[PDB]
């Protein structure tokens, strides 16, 4: 009936103990909330079948959301997120390996 989404977030060069104390894992935008472990991993429980969009939220590091499809029999698959062309699939690994692209650009340079 209900399943769990496992994953292992990782930031290059930075240790987990430096950023896990402020990050979360949101499935369908606060519809399901999970938190990260000490080694960077994470597990979200009580996920019924369907297509959700997992995103690791952190104020100091950005991650790319991943679309996870869970069939009613438990089979879990991952792919890219594309709201246009909701039929396109780009097979991503599973359990989710969500690496960061560095800190986000909150500011615009002068001039």
């Amino acid at each position: 009936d209900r399943f769990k989404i496992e994953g292992r977030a990782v930031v290059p060069g930075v240790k987990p103990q430096d950023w896990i104390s402020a990050a979360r894992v949101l499935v369908d935008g606060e519809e399901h909330v999970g938190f990260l472990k000490t080694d960077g991993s994470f597990v979200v429980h009580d996920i019924p079948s369907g297509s959700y969009v997992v995103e690791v939220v952190s104020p100091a590091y950005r991650f790319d959301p991943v679309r996870v499809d869970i069939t009613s029999k438990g089979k879990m698959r991952a792919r890219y997120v594309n709201y246009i062309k909701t039929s396109e699939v780009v097979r991503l690994p599973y359990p989710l390996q969500m690496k960061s692209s560095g800190p986000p650009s909150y500011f615009i340079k002068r001039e």
Partner: protein, 449 residues
């Protein structure tokens, strides 16, 4: 434009505190708090800032059911008893997360054996489970007999190597089930009749060696039962101790188990009537009134190892005179107030009273015992009081602002200069020559300034 801090400001809040854990090294300055906003944070002891914070779902799916502390780890049970987590307080992350079996949640407690805490005990209206501590893997799980009628509400265990699940039927019999820790087999089962008893969670409590104790005001006595070496509720009256329960009130027994692996404390507290407590001691079947605290608002316990102490709060001259509250420390082994251990504070609002009281004790340099008190009032205000005199309030935190419902921005009053513009303009002078001199005098005052 990377000009931060000049215009914007952010204030982080956590909701009304529901479970606070102050038992620590306590050399580390940490204060873990679970709130009524489904938030678990680690407040700083010395300043009151948020070290780390974790915000769960704002709906009922995120309600924290129970919270215990073992060493540097904090075990939390939430989502109606469905999810269990272990937070590491230093890093602020997670140690392990597991999903508990369905069913209502009734009690959570640690168990151990051989002078070491090894497992966690979870109680649900249909079953008692024991999980590991460092891994979260389920050790075993056992059904509860007569679960359809017996509401199981308590879990007690120490180094004896067994667990006691205590259930009651409203205005009917109570039933104790003693399981073994290393096997899960039901070792023993006991039933006792209770026409007077109505609750087991907020009414009864276990004492030093599996001693269930709680009052019946219908007979105005205390019923006792040594779960180890007894099977009958010995009834001890309070007429010898001159104590009386509050008419139409539900009395309460408050024990203290400092170590979840060793025996409990023979001494305990008894709440007979609101604003009235009594510190008693149970010794091999008889009670001894150690102290009687009348007009006392709140009480709390602490251990600092072996020097177990209690803290009581009372008004100064009174319903309180000027919201002047004094907190004092007593020893559990003997109701002797500890000298030079009085904290006096005051609440700025009129109809505000303290509601919670947690104590963090340490050993002073001169072999004495010092303490800091976390007091939560009616308006969700948190106060951290220290033993000093000029700074009796270490840090305050207004958590009532986590639920802003309305907001309006009013313009500040007019400056002393802009106040003059109303004078010269709008006085409605009779003639032009009069208004001329009026405006000239205003500008003259301006040039003088």
């Amino acid at each position: 434009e990377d000009q931060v801090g000049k215009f914007d400001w952010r204030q982080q809040y956590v909701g009304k505190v529901k479970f606070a854990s102050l038992e620590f090294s306590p050399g580390s300055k940490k204060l873990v708090v679970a709130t009524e906003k489904n938030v678990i944070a680690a407040l700083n002891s010395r300043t009151g800032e948020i070290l780390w914070r974790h915000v769960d779902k704002g709906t009922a799916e995120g309600a924290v059911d129970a919270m215990l502390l073992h060493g540097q780890d904090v075990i939390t049970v939430s989502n109606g008893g469905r999810i269990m987590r272990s937070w590491e307080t230093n890093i602020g992350g997670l140690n392990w997360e597991i999903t508990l079996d369905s069913g209502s949640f009734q009690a959570l407690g640690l168990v151990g054996l051989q002078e070491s805490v090894r497992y966690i005990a979870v109680l649900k209206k249909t079953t008692l489970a024991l999980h590991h501590l460092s891994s979260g893997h389920l050790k075993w799980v056992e059904h509860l007999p007569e679960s359809d009628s017996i509401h199981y509400q308590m879990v007690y265990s120490y180094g004896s190597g067994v667990v006691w699940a205590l259930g009651v039927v409203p205005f009917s019999h109570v039933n104790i089930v003693k399981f073994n820790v290393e096997d899960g087999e039901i070792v023993q089962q006991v039933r006792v009749s209770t026409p007077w008893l109505q609750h087991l969670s907020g009414a009864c409590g276990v004492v030093d060696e599996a001693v269930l104790v709680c009052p019946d005001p219908s007979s105005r006595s205390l019923q006792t039962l040594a779960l180890e070496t007894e099977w009958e509720l010995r009834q001890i009256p309070l007429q010898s101790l001159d104590l009386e329960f509050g008419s139409g009130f539900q009395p309460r027994v408050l024990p203290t188990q400092p170590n979840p692996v060793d025996a409990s404390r023979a001494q305990f507290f008894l709440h007979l009537s609101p604003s009235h407590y009594a510190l008693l001691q149970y010794h091999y079947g008889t009670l001894s009134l150690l102290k009687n605290f009348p007009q006392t608002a709140l009480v709390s316990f602490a251990t600092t190892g072996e020097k177990t102490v209690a803290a009581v709060m009372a008004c100064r001259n009174e319903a309180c005179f000027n919201q002047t509250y004094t907190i004092n420390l007593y020893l559990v082994e003997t109701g002797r107030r500890l000298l030079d251990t009085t904290i006096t504070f005051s609440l700025e609002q009129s109809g505000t009273r303290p509601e919670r009281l947690y104590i963090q004790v340490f050993l002073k340099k001169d072999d004495s015992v010092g303490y800091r008190a976390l007091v939560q009032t009616e308006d969700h205000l948190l106060l951290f009081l220290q033993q000093l005199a000029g700074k009796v309030v270490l840090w305050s935190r207004e958590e009532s602002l986590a639920e802003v419902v309305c907001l309006e921005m009013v313009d500040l009053p007019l400056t002393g200069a802009q106040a003059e513009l109303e004078g010269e303009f709008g006085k409605k002078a009779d003639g032009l020559l009069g208004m001329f001199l009026k405006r000239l005098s205003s500008q003259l005052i301006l040039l003088q300034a």
